[PDB]
Amino acid sequence: ISAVLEEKILGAAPKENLEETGRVLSIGDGIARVYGLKNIQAEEMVEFSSGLKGMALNLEPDNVGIVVFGNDKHIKEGDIVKRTGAIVDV
């Protein structure tokens, strides 16, 4: 009965794979802090929902600071950021 209640409490919120996906807490001036991306590496490229690219520079305990390779107007707070799995390369 209790486990079903806590399952209902968890299911009241959407399911997010925070290891490889992140939500933008704040986007601005080409630098976005995201909640999530638990398996991100330093200097690792990420992709935003709008198709832009970013680089995970700051690995903070609460958020991840990502420098955005483009204009920040296409990124909204709460957008989906996913890891590319590799360090930045050309």
Place this chain on the structure above:
Amino acid sequence: ALVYGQMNEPPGARARVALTGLTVAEYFRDQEGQDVLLFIDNIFRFTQAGSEVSALLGRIPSAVGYQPTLATDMGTMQERITTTKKGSITSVQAIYVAHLDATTVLSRAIAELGIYPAVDPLDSTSRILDPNIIGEEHYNIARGVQKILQDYKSLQDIIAILGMDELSEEDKLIVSRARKIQRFLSQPFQVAEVFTGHAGKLVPIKDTIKGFKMILNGELDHLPEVAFYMVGPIEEVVAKAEKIAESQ
């Protein structure tokens, strides 16, 4: 079209006045295909307002304010002032006395000599003065006029030191051609035809090139100096000299 921001306005208000003026200019460029002037008074106060905004926000310290790069600060504004296939925005910054393509310096001494506009011919530089852009003949004429003016300043210094007789009549001919050039640099203004009484004229670039080429070649060297004053084209100089000769 005028956009104003007072000094009693908040720092955020003054940091976006240039964006409002640029937006009006961008409408005139994109939706009409026109070459649009954008006068900004000035870039220094725009940088000051951006620095005050950054100081109020508290993120960027006051040591760094509104670099010409960094599209958040000024790079977007500078790159939106450009020439495209539809039109162009030409930025003129009013400076009262860093990345300027051209510079027109106004001096009190040139106005004291009666030359309107009081543009200093030697201190007004331009990055565009190259044979590979504006043509070889335009650069050659401009370099010859500048060299003649510099030699004229040296000759005036020599005359002030010793006297008006130096190096036979060649220096006198150089002085006479330089003074005719200085008179021909002056021009009546359309906007000031009621305060000065002289009807302003619009001179195309080919007319200026032809007139200064004829002065450099000495084709109009027999005309009086005062006939070269406040005249738009070079045919007006010929008509002025003919009227002087008929009257005198």
